[PDB]
Amino acid sequence: IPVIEPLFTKVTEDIPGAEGPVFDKNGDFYIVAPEVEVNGKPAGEILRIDLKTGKKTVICKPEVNGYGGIPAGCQCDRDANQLFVADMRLGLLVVQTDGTFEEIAKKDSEGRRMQGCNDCAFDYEGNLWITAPAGEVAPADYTRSMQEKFGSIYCFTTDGQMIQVDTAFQFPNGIAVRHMNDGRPYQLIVAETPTKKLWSYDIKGPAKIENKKVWGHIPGTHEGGADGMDFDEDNNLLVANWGSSHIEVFGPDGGQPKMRIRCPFEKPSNLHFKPQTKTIFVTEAENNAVWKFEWQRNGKKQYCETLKFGIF
Ligand SMILES: [Ca+2]
Ligand SMILES: [Ca+2]
């Protein structure tokens, strides 16, 4: 498979478990630090990074009834400038730029206890597709589906329902939505880390997925596998392959990667494009750091880059 080795430029450093890179509607940049702990207990953080200096500010260190969060993945909303944050202990959070937050769900739409979440992806209709590789949220004892198949997938809909849409994954992790050229959502892609698979579904409607398929094969037999992912503007899927030293690039039809991107580190964890550019910000777990490099084309626009009251 062809490999490229673009220059990686350092962005910031010393962020335990550096994850969930995201841009807001004003172009500010945020990362999560899921692995910060206090006295050995979770005390994860959500940070704003000043891109010009690399300096970090902790805007939110979420805790609910004394249980600290493990914030792990982010999306920006469209109608309000607020972050949706998948948290391995707290489920789904909505975080304001002032650092305040709310916990969205202790239970799902069927009354089952919510599971801790890892990453999420908004479709253009505003529905939020979420991976949940942890067991039940706090106050339940922390568990995660690295060995056993209890990871789930949710869709948090525009009408505020937290709907479990699949179960029995071994650590569902990154997630992405493919859209038709006209904007209609039509495929959901889910990483299952240790099995070295990417799974697809047909999106038939809000919270309606069917036709589950093994869509993509992640190289290697290292511990790790597919972590975070995003589409470029041509619908190529870029996937951090934690433990492989590469980001994989899948074409529109999946299968094997058509290209790999070598990183100067072993454990890329997640990635995000800067709007209106070819620049991909990459988090990684070897150095607990953030980098950037130039891809071949711009990113696929995120939901927060679309317009509610647009004409075209
Ligand atoms: Ca992840
Ligand atoms: Ca991303």
UniProtKB/Swiss-Prot annotation:
EC class name: hydrolase
Activity under varying temperature: Optimum temperature is 35 degrees Celsius.
Binding site for Ca(2+) 2: D230, L271, H272
Consequence when changing F171S: 68% decrease in activity
Resulting phenotype, Q302W: 3% decrease in activity
Mutagenesis or variant effect for M146A: 26% decrease in activity
GO terms assigned for molecular function: calcium ion binding; diisopropyl-fluorophosphatase activity
Classification via SUPFAM superfamilies: Calcium-dependent phosphotriesterase (SSF63829)
Keywords attached to this entry: Calcium, Hydrolase, Metal-binding
Biotechnology usage: Has potential application in bio-remediation by detoxification of organo-phosphates used in insecticides or nerve agents used in chemical warfare such as soman, tabun and sarin.
Phenotype for H222N: 14% increase in activity
Activity regulation as described: Inhibited by chelating agents.
Impact when changing N173D: 98% decrease in activity
Binding-site residues, Ca(2+) 1: E19, N118, N173, D227
Effect annotated for changing E35Q: 50% decrease in activity
Effect of Q302F: 50% decrease in activity
Details of cofactor binding: Binds 2 calcium ions per subunit.
Active-site residues (renumbered): A285
Quaternary structure and interacting proteins, as annotated: Monomer.
Function of the molecule: Biological function and substrate unknown. However, it is capable of acting on phosphorus anhydride bonds (such as phosphorus-halide and phosphorus-cyanide) in organophosphorus compounds (including nerve gases).
Protein name: Diisopropyl-fluorophosphatase
